[PDB]
Write a structure and sequence with these properties.
Monomeric. This protein has about 150 residues and is mainly alpha-helical. Helix content is about 75%, strand content about 0%. The longest helix has 24 residues. It binds protoporphyrin IX containing FE. Protoporphyrin IX containing FE binds next to α4, α5 and α6.
Length: about 150
């Protein structure tokens, strides 16, 4: 459970993300693919991009960045009350895309990295802890829904 204080720290940082959603989303996916290259194998649509500069130049990767942050932003704004938002995401990521929880840990690490890179003044230890707690709650709840669908990834 996040406190009101922790949610405010999360949603203040998120408001900065929403000022350049496409830039943040693209940088998060590129960070993911750079830090954990195996993750790129899950994306038939992007696995032809070979350099960081090619990924940065990809309008289609950037649009997927917007998808991912729009979905996560809607979940974070529910402050834990996100059953309805997780349902479709759990169904696709468990049974179609087959995304293990360790890859949701990797993308969580990429989110923390990009938000600290872009907002070092306003993303110190307490805001990082609160964002980590929010992403931990997301991963815990989606893992529970994964298992309800029979997926042990
Ligand atoms: C914060 C975490 C994530 C959020 C909010 C998220 C959200 C989304 C959304 C909204 C879609 C489009 C609708 C859908 O199919 O459900 C999507 C598609 C997809 N996601 Fe995720 N995603 C997450 C993490 C990941 C990770 C870590 C991987 C792989 C390592 C992944 C791989 C997939 C793939 C393969 C698609 C289909 C992409 C395509 O259009 O070709 N996702 N994701």
């Amino acid at each position: 459970v996040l406190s009101e204080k922790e949610w405010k720290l999360v949603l203040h940082v998120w408001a900065k993300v929403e000022k350049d959603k496409a830039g943040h989303g693209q940088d998060i996916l590129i960070r993911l693919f750079k830090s954990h290259p195996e993750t790129l194998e899950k994306f038939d649509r992007f696995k032809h991009l070979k350099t960081e500069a090619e990924m940065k130049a990809s309008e289609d990767l950037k649009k997927h960045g917007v998808t991912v942050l729009t979905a996560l932003g809607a979940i974070l704004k529910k402050k834990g009350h996100h059953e309805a938002e997780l349902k479709p995401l759990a169904q696709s990521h468990a049974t179609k895309h087959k995304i293990p929880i360790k890859y949701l840990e990797f993308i969580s690490e990429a989110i923390i990295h990009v938000l600290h890179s872009r907002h070092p003044g306003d993303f110190g230890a307490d805001a990082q802890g609160a964002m980590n707690k929010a992403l931990e709650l997301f991963r815990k709840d989606i893992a529970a829904k994964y298992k309800e669908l029979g997926y042990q990834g």
